[PDB]
Amino acid sequence: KDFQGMLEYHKEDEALLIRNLVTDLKPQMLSGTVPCLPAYILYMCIRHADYTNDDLKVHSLLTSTINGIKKVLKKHNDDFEMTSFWLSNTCRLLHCLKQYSGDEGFMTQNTAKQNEHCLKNFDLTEYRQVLSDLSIQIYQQLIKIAEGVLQPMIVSAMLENESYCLEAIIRQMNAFHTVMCDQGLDPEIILQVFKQLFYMINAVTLNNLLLRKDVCSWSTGMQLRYNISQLEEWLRGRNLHQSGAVQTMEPLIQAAQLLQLKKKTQEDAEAICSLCTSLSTQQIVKILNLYTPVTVAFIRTIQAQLQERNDPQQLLLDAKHMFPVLFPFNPSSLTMDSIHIPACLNLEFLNEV
Protein backbone atom coordinates (compact mmCIF):
# COMPACT_ATOMS: atom_id res chain seq x y z
CA LYS A 1 0.00 0.00 0.00
CA ASP A 2 3.02 2.25 -0.52
CA PHE A 3 3.96 2.87 3.12
CA GLN A 4 5.12 6.36 3.80
CA GLY A 5 7.55 6.25 6.76
CA MET A 6 4.91 6.75 9.49
CA LEU A 7 2.90 5.16 12.30
CA GLU A 8 -0.17 6.21 14.24
CA TYR A 9 -1.50 5.14 17.65
CA HIS A 10 -4.99 5.83 19.06
CA LYS A 11 -4.04 8.94 21.15
CA GLU A 12 -4.26 6.38 23.87
CA ASP A 13 -2.11 3.28 23.86
CA GLU A 14 0.49 6.04 24.06
CA ALA A 15 1.08 4.40 27.39
CA LEU A 16 0.91 0.92 25.92
CA LEU A 17 3.29 2.10 23.20
CA ILE A 18 5.88 3.56 25.56
CA ARG A 19 5.77 0.48 27.69
CA ASN A 20 6.20 -2.19 25.09
CA LEU A 21 8.75 -0.12 23.22
CA VAL A 22 10.79 1.08 26.15
CA THR A 23 9.82 -0.24 29.56
CA ASP A 24 9.31 -3.91 28.75
CA LEU A 25 11.73 -3.78 25.90
CA LYS A 26 14.71 -6.01 26.67
CA PRO A 27 17.47 -5.49 24.06
CA GLN A 28 18.36 -9.16 23.89
CA MET A 29 15.20 -9.11 21.73
CA LEU A 30 17.11 -8.70 18.38
CA SER A 31 16.66 -6.81 16.38
CA GLY A 32 17.22 -8.90 14.30
CA THR A 33 16.29 -5.62 12.52
CA VAL A 34 17.82 -2.48 14.10
CA PRO A 35 19.97 -2.10 17.23
CA CYS A 36 18.02 1.08 17.69
CA LEU A 37 14.67 0.16 16.13
CA PRO A 38 13.12 1.90 19.13
CA ALA A 39 14.67 5.21 18.15
CA TYR A 40 13.41 4.93 14.59
CA ILE A 41 10.03 3.51 15.43
CA LEU A 42 9.49 6.56 17.70
CA TYR A 43 10.38 9.06 15.01
CA MET A 44 7.94 7.35 12.73
CA CYS A 45 5.33 8.28 15.33
CA ILE A 46 6.55 11.85 15.71
CA ARG A 47 6.09 12.06 12.00
CA HIS A 48 2.47 10.90 12.05
CA ALA A 49 1.86 13.57 14.67
CA ASP A 50 3.47 16.25 12.60
CA TYR A 51 1.37 15.13 9.67
CA THR A 52 -1.85 15.62 11.67
CA ASN A 53 -0.52 18.81 13.21
CA ASP A 54 -1.22 17.28 16.65
CA ASP A 55 1.18 19.22 18.85
CA LEU A 56 -0.29 17.56 21.87
CA LYS A 57 0.57 14.12 20.52
CA VAL A 58 4.28 15.05 19.96
CA HIS A 59 4.81 16.76 23.33
CA SER A 60 3.09 13.87 25.09
CA LEU A 61 4.87 11.15 23.05
CA LEU A 62 8.37 12.31 23.76
CA THR A 63 7.75 13.33 27.35
CA SER A 64 6.18 9.94 28.09
CA THR A 65 9.21 8.47 26.34
CA ILE A 66 11.82 10.38 28.38
CA ASN A 67 9.93 9.30 31.47
CA GLY A 68 10.29 5.68 30.36
CA ILE A 69 13.96 5.87 29.37
CA LYS A 70 14.73 7.56 32.72
CA LYS A 71 12.58 5.05 34.51
CA VAL A 72 14.28 1.99 33.02
CA LEU A 73 17.68 3.62 33.38
CA LYS A 74 17.09 3.83 37.12
CA LYS A 75 15.90 0.25 37.39
CA HIS A 76 19.22 -0.82 35.73
CA ASN A 77 21.90 1.64 36.99
CA ASP A 78 24.31 -1.25 37.27
CA ASP A 79 23.93 -3.01 33.91
CA PHE A 80 26.23 -1.78 31.11
CA GLU A 81 24.02 -3.30 28.43
CA MET A 82 20.84 -1.24 28.95
CA THR A 83 22.60 2.04 29.47
CA SER A 84 24.62 1.25 26.38
CA PHE A 85 21.35 0.35 24.64
CA TRP A 86 19.28 3.36 25.72
CA LEU A 87 22.26 5.68 25.20
CA SER A 88 22.55 4.84 21.50
CA ASN A 89 18.77 4.75 21.07
CA THR A 90 18.34 8.20 22.69
CA CYS A 91 21.18 9.34 20.54
CA ARG A 92 19.58 8.07 17.39
CA LEU A 93 16.22 9.48 18.24
CA LEU A 94 18.16 12.73 18.45
CA HIS A 95 19.95 12.11 15.16
CA CYS A 96 16.56 11.51 13.52
CA LEU A 97 15.15 14.80 14.86
CA LYS A 98 18.20 16.62 13.56
CA GLN A 99 18.23 14.59 10.31
CA TYR A 100 14.58 15.00 9.55
CA SER A 101 12.99 17.97 11.22
CA GLY A 102 16.22 19.78 10.53
CA ASP A 103 16.73 22.47 8.00
CA GLU A 104 19.15 22.82 5.11
CA GLY A 105 21.83 22.76 7.77
CA PHE A 106 21.36 19.00 8.38
CA MET A 107 19.83 18.21 5.03
CA THR A 108 23.29 18.27 3.40
CA GLN A 109 23.46 14.51 3.33
CA ASN A 110 19.90 13.31 2.71
CA THR A 111 18.45 11.54 -0.31
CA ALA A 112 15.36 13.19 -1.79
CA LYS A 113 13.45 10.32 -0.31
CA GLN A 114 14.90 11.38 3.06
CA ASN A 115 14.11 15.09 2.46
CA GLU A 116 10.59 13.94 1.83
CA HIS A 117 10.34 12.15 5.17
CA CYS A 118 11.05 15.15 7.28
CA LEU A 119 8.76 17.06 9.65
CA LYS A 120 6.74 19.81 7.88
CA ASN A 121 4.60 21.33 10.67
CA PHE A 122 6.76 21.46 13.86
CA ASP A 123 10.03 22.83 15.01
CA LEU A 124 11.22 20.46 17.68
CA THR A 125 14.50 22.12 18.66
CA GLU A 126 13.31 22.35 22.33
CA TYR A 127 13.03 18.53 22.66
CA ARG A 128 16.29 18.29 20.73
CA GLN A 129 18.00 20.18 23.53
CA VAL A 130 16.27 18.02 26.18
CA LEU A 131 17.24 14.65 24.57
CA SER A 132 20.83 15.72 24.24
CA ASP A 133 20.80 16.82 27.97
CA LEU A 134 19.44 13.40 28.83
CA SER A 135 21.97 11.52 26.74
CA ILE A 136 24.71 13.43 28.52
CA GLN A 137 23.25 11.93 31.74
CA ILE A 138 23.04 8.38 30.24
CA TYR A 139 26.66 8.60 29.20
CA GLN A 140 27.66 9.67 32.67
CA GLN A 141 25.76 6.59 34.00
CA LEU A 142 27.63 4.39 31.55
CA ILE A 143 30.96 5.69 32.81
CA LYS A 144 29.74 5.08 36.35
CA ILE A 145 29.02 1.42 35.55
CA ALA A 146 32.27 0.88 33.67
CA GLU A 147 34.18 2.52 36.50
CA GLY A 148 32.48 0.22 38.94
CA VAL A 149 33.49 -2.84 36.98
CA LEU A 150 37.17 -1.77 36.49
CA GLN A 151 38.04 0.00 39.76
CA PRO A 152 38.72 -3.33 41.52
CA MET A 153 40.88 -4.63 38.66
CA ILE A 154 43.23 -1.72 37.93
CA VAL A 155 45.55 -1.96 40.88
CA SER A 156 45.68 -5.76 40.63
CA ALA A 157 45.89 -6.38 36.91
CA MET A 158 48.57 -3.75 36.98
CA LEU A 159 51.18 -3.31 39.67
CA GLU A 160 50.91 -7.01 40.84
CA ASN A 161 52.77 -9.94 39.24
CA GLU A 162 51.47 -13.50 38.61
CA SER A 163 42.69 -12.56 41.02
CA TYR A 164 42.96 -10.17 38.04
CA CYS A 165 45.57 -9.86 35.23
CA LEU A 166 46.06 -7.53 32.31
CA GLU A 167 44.12 -10.31 30.51
CA ALA A 168 41.00 -9.63 32.67
CA ILE A 169 41.23 -5.91 31.98
CA ILE A 170 41.71 -6.47 28.35
CA ARG A 171 38.85 -9.03 28.33
CA GLN A 172 36.72 -6.38 29.98
CA MET A 173 37.64 -3.71 27.46
CA ASN A 174 36.51 -6.11 24.70
CA ALA A 175 33.25 -6.85 26.51
CA PHE A 176 32.48 -3.16 26.82
CA HIS A 177 33.43 -2.60 23.16
CA THR A 178 31.49 -5.58 21.95
CA VAL A 179 28.25 -4.53 23.63
CA MET A 180 28.63 -0.94 22.52
CA CYS A 181 29.21 -1.87 18.90
CA ASP A 182 26.40 -4.44 18.85
CA GLN A 183 24.11 -1.70 20.31
CA GLY A 184 24.83 0.51 17.29
CA LEU A 185 26.35 3.23 19.46
CA ASP A 186 28.09 5.91 17.40
CA PRO A 187 31.83 5.32 16.86
CA GLU A 188 32.74 8.77 18.28
CA ILE A 189 31.02 7.91 21.61
CA ILE A 190 32.80 4.57 21.69
CA LEU A 191 36.03 6.46 21.20
CA GLN A 192 35.08 8.90 24.01
CA VAL A 193 34.27 6.09 26.42
CA PHE A 194 37.63 4.36 26.04
CA LYS A 195 39.41 7.65 26.52
CA GLN A 196 37.58 7.98 29.84
CA LEU A 197 38.28 4.45 31.01
CA PHE A 198 41.95 4.61 30.10
CA TYR A 199 42.26 7.91 31.99
CA MET A 200 40.89 6.16 35.04
CA ILE A 201 43.41 3.34 34.68
CA ASN A 202 46.15 5.97 34.55
CA ALA A 203 44.79 7.88 37.49
CA VAL A 204 44.02 4.97 39.77
CA THR A 205 47.38 3.23 39.14
CA LEU A 206 49.53 6.30 39.41
CA ASN A 207 47.60 7.26 42.57
CA ASN A 208 48.54 3.88 44.05
CA LEU A 209 52.18 3.97 43.27
CA LEU A 210 52.28 7.24 45.13
CA LEU A 211 51.06 5.58 48.30
CA ARG A 212 51.08 1.81 48.30
CA LYS A 213 53.89 -0.53 49.47
CA ASP A 214 55.45 1.84 48.99
CA VAL A 215 55.95 2.98 45.30
CA CYS A 216 57.44 -0.28 44.12
CA SER A 217 60.43 -0.94 41.93
CA TRP A 218 62.35 -1.38 38.66
CA SER A 219 60.31 -4.58 38.37
CA THR A 220 57.05 -2.59 38.69
CA GLY A 221 58.33 -0.03 36.19
CA MET A 222 58.73 -2.82 33.64
CA GLN A 223 55.27 -4.40 34.10
CA LEU A 224 53.60 -1.03 33.62
CA ARG A 225 55.43 -0.26 30.38
CA TYR A 226 54.50 -3.71 29.14
CA ASN A 227 50.96 -3.29 30.38
CA ILE A 228 50.47 0.14 28.76
CA SER A 229 51.91 -1.17 25.44
CA GLN A 230 49.56 -4.16 25.52
CA LEU A 231 46.67 -1.66 26.25
CA GLU A 232 48.09 0.44 23.39
CA GLU A 233 48.30 -2.54 21.08
CA TRP A 234 44.75 -3.43 22.11
CA LEU A 235 43.70 0.05 20.97
CA ARG A 236 45.51 -0.27 17.64
CA GLY A 237 43.76 -3.62 17.02
CA ARG A 238 40.21 -2.41 17.60
CA ASN A 239 41.22 0.79 15.70
CA LEU A 240 40.75 3.02 18.73
CA HIS A 241 44.19 4.67 18.88
CA GLN A 242 42.73 7.97 17.58
CA SER A 243 40.56 8.09 20.76
CA GLY A 244 43.25 10.02 22.68
CA ALA A 245 43.33 7.29 25.32
CA VAL A 246 47.08 6.61 25.14
CA GLN A 247 47.66 10.24 25.73
CA THR A 248 45.66 10.00 28.92
CA MET A 249 48.40 7.82 30.34
CA GLU A 250 51.49 9.92 29.85
CA PRO A 251 51.98 10.43 33.58
CA LEU A 252 52.01 6.67 34.22
CA ILE A 253 54.26 6.06 31.17
CA GLN A 254 56.56 8.61 32.74
CA ALA A 255 56.25 7.11 36.26
CA ALA A 256 57.11 3.74 34.83
CA GLN A 257 60.09 5.20 33.09
CA LEU A 258 61.04 7.11 36.21
CA LEU A 259 61.38 3.82 37.95
CA GLN A 260 63.89 2.39 35.52
CA LEU A 261 65.90 5.37 34.51
CA LYS A 262 69.28 5.44 36.32
CA LYS A 263 69.22 7.48 39.54
CA LYS A 264 72.68 8.53 40.72
CA THR A 265 75.05 10.83 38.83
CA GLN A 266 74.03 14.30 37.66
CA GLU A 267 73.61 13.26 34.03
CA ASP A 268 71.01 10.90 35.42
CA ALA A 269 69.10 13.72 37.19
CA GLU A 270 69.16 15.90 33.98
CA ALA A 271 67.36 13.08 32.27
CA ILE A 272 64.58 12.67 34.86
CA CYS A 273 63.66 16.33 34.35
CA SER A 274 63.47 16.42 30.55
CA LEU A 275 61.54 13.15 30.38
CA CYS A 276 59.21 13.70 33.34
CA THR A 277 57.36 16.78 32.05
CA SER A 278 53.92 15.45 32.67
CA LEU A 279 54.62 14.67 36.32
CA SER A 280 54.66 17.30 39.09
CA THR A 281 57.94 17.91 40.90
CA GLN A 282 56.45 16.56 44.10
CA GLN A 283 55.18 13.51 42.33
CA ILE A 284 58.72 12.78 41.01
CA VAL A 285 60.37 13.42 44.40
CA LYS A 286 57.74 11.18 45.99
CA ILE A 287 58.34 8.35 43.55
CA LEU A 288 62.00 8.88 44.23
CA ASN A 289 61.69 8.61 48.00
CA LEU A 290 59.41 5.65 47.83
CA TYR A 291 61.85 3.73 45.58
CA THR A 292 63.12 0.30 46.77
CA PRO A 293 65.85 -1.77 45.19
CA VAL A 294 67.74 7.21 46.01
CA THR A 295 69.56 9.77 48.08
CA VAL A 296 68.80 13.22 49.25
CA ALA A 297 70.93 15.68 47.27
CA PHE A 298 69.98 13.58 44.30
CA ILE A 299 66.57 14.81 45.17
CA ARG A 300 67.84 18.25 46.00
CA THR A 301 69.37 18.70 42.56
CA ILE A 302 66.02 17.64 41.07
CA GLN A 303 63.71 19.90 42.89
CA ALA A 304 66.41 22.51 42.34
CA GLN A 305 65.59 22.67 38.65
CA LEU A 306 61.93 22.07 38.49
CA GLN A 307 61.17 25.28 40.46
CA GLU A 308 57.41 25.79 39.88
CA ARG A 309 57.09 23.56 36.80
CA ASN A 310 54.53 22.85 37.98
CA ASP A 311 53.97 22.48 41.78
CA PRO A 312 51.98 22.30 43.73
CA GLN A 313 48.58 20.97 42.86
CA GLN A 314 46.27 18.57 44.60
CA LEU A 315 48.21 15.18 44.52
CA LEU A 316 46.06 12.03 43.97
CA LEU A 317 44.47 13.13 40.55
CA ASP A 318 40.72 12.58 40.97
CA ALA A 319 40.08 9.88 38.53
CA LYS A 320 36.44 10.75 38.69
CA HIS A 321 37.25 13.72 36.44
CA MET A 322 34.76 13.05 33.72
CA PHE A 323 35.85 14.53 30.39
CA PRO A 324 33.05 16.20 28.50
CA VAL A 325 30.90 14.29 26.09
CA LEU A 326 30.30 15.39 22.44
CA PHE A 327 27.76 13.79 20.06
CA PRO A 328 28.59 14.70 16.50
CA PHE A 329 25.51 14.52 14.30
CA ASN A 330 25.56 11.43 12.18
CA PRO A 331 22.59 10.99 9.86
CA SER A 332 21.80 7.44 8.77
CA SER A 333 21.24 5.87 5.35
CA LEU A 334 18.44 3.49 6.31
CA THR A 335 14.97 4.77 5.52
CA MET A 336 11.94 4.12 7.54
CA ASP A 337 10.13 3.30 4.33
CA SER A 338 11.63 -0.15 4.85
CA ILE A 339 12.29 -1.10 8.44
CA HIS A 340 11.20 -4.27 10.04
CA ILE A 341 8.93 -4.16 13.04
CA PRO A 342 8.82 -7.77 14.43
CA ALA A 343 5.70 -9.28 15.95
CA CYS A 344 7.47 -10.59 18.99
CA LEU A 345 6.77 -7.16 20.49
CA ASN A 346 3.03 -6.60 20.41
CA LEU A 347 3.22 -3.34 18.57
CA GLU A 348 0.63 -4.53 16.01
CA PHE A 349 -1.92 -2.01 17.33
CA LEU A 350 0.27 0.40 15.36
CA ASN A 351 -1.12 1.41 11.99
CA GLU A 352 1.35 1.52 9.09
CA VAL A 353 -0.48 4.35 7.29
Author numbering: 1464 to 1625, 1651 to 1781, 1789 to 1848
Question: What text comes from the article?
Answer:
Type V myosin (MyoV) motors move protein complexes, organelles, vesicles, and mRNAs along actin cables. The C-terminal globular domain (GD) defines this class of myosins and mediates the majority of cargo interactions. In vertebrate Myo5a, the GD also mediates autoinhibition of ATPase activity in its cargo-free state.
The asymmetric unit contains one Myo5b molecule (Rwork = 0.25, Rfree = 0.31), which shares with Myo5a the overall conservation of domain organization. An overlay of both structures reveals a root mean square deviation (RMSD) of only 1.1 Å. Myo5a and Myo5b GDs share 70.5% identical amino acids. A higher degree of deviation was observed for Myo5b. However, these two residues are fully conserved in all three paralogs (red-boxed amino acids) and are in the same position in Myo5a, Myo5b, and Myo5c.
